[PDB]
Amino acid sequence: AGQIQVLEGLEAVRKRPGMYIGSTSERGLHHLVWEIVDNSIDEALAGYANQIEVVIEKDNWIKVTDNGRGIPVDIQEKMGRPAVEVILTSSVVNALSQDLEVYVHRNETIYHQAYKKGVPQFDLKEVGTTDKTGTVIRFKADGEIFTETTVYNYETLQQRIRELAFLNKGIQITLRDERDEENVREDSYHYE
Numbered sequence: 226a227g228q229i230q231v232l233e234g235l236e237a238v239r240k241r242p243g244m245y246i247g248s249t250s251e252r253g254l255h256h257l258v259w260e261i262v263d264n265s266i267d268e269a270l271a272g273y274a275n276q277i278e279v280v281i282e283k284d285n286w287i288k289v290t291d292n293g294r295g296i297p298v299d300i301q302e303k304m305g306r307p308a309v310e311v312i313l314t315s316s317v318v319n320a321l322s323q324d325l326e327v328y329v330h331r332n333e334t335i336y337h338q339a340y341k342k343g344v345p346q347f348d349l350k351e352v353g354t355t356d357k358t359g360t361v362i363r364f365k366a367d368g369e370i371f372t373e374t375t376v377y378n379y380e381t382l383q384q385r386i387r388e389l390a391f392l393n394k395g396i397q398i399t400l401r402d403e404r405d406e407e408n409v410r411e412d413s414y415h416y417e
């Protein structure tokens with residue numbers, strides 16, 4: 226019943242995306258980033274992260290990295306699935322992304338899963354080792370949902386990231402635009 230309910234959730238969000246994120250215009254596109262960044266900020270506020278990096282990658286992928294605990298990977302009694310899988314298959318960003326990847330650094334291990342329109346492409350995999358903790362999320366907004374534009378606006382991201390760092394003092398939040406490899410722009414904010 227758990228994973229059927231997952232599938233129905235994805236269908237619901239993709240059918241009425243604007244009920245979930247406000248709009249499917251440029252505003253809703255940028256709201257994807259806010260949803261993810263907000264979750265990292267909660268992890269900082271909980272006491273466990275202090276650095277968040279947002280990268281606009283080639284072809285308008287977004288990568289958000291935090292140095293928090295890493296999303297848990299333990300098997301849920303609820304779903305019979307790893308915790309990270311439950312969390313990401315119930316994410317609006319994931320449902321509304323053509324593709325999304327997560328890398329978790331936790332338990333001295335790097336774990337990876339990928340998704341399309343919220344559907345996992347393979348089971349969560351151990352792919353390496355690590356001496357850090359945190360989470361990396363990379364996603365590509367689905368152009369079938371965001372029919373006006375899937376191109377992010379650096380200045381829009383910059384303005385809100387600046388505001389978020391100012392509001393959440395102590396968190397280092399970095400924005401980087403790598404879309405043009407010949408001219409990479411970065412702004413990093415860190416208030417007291």
Ligand SMILES: [Cl-]
Nearest residue numbers: 297298299331
């Ligand atoms: Cl875990």
Ligand SMILES: [Mg+2]
Nearest residue numbers: 263264267268
């Ligand atoms: Mg939260």
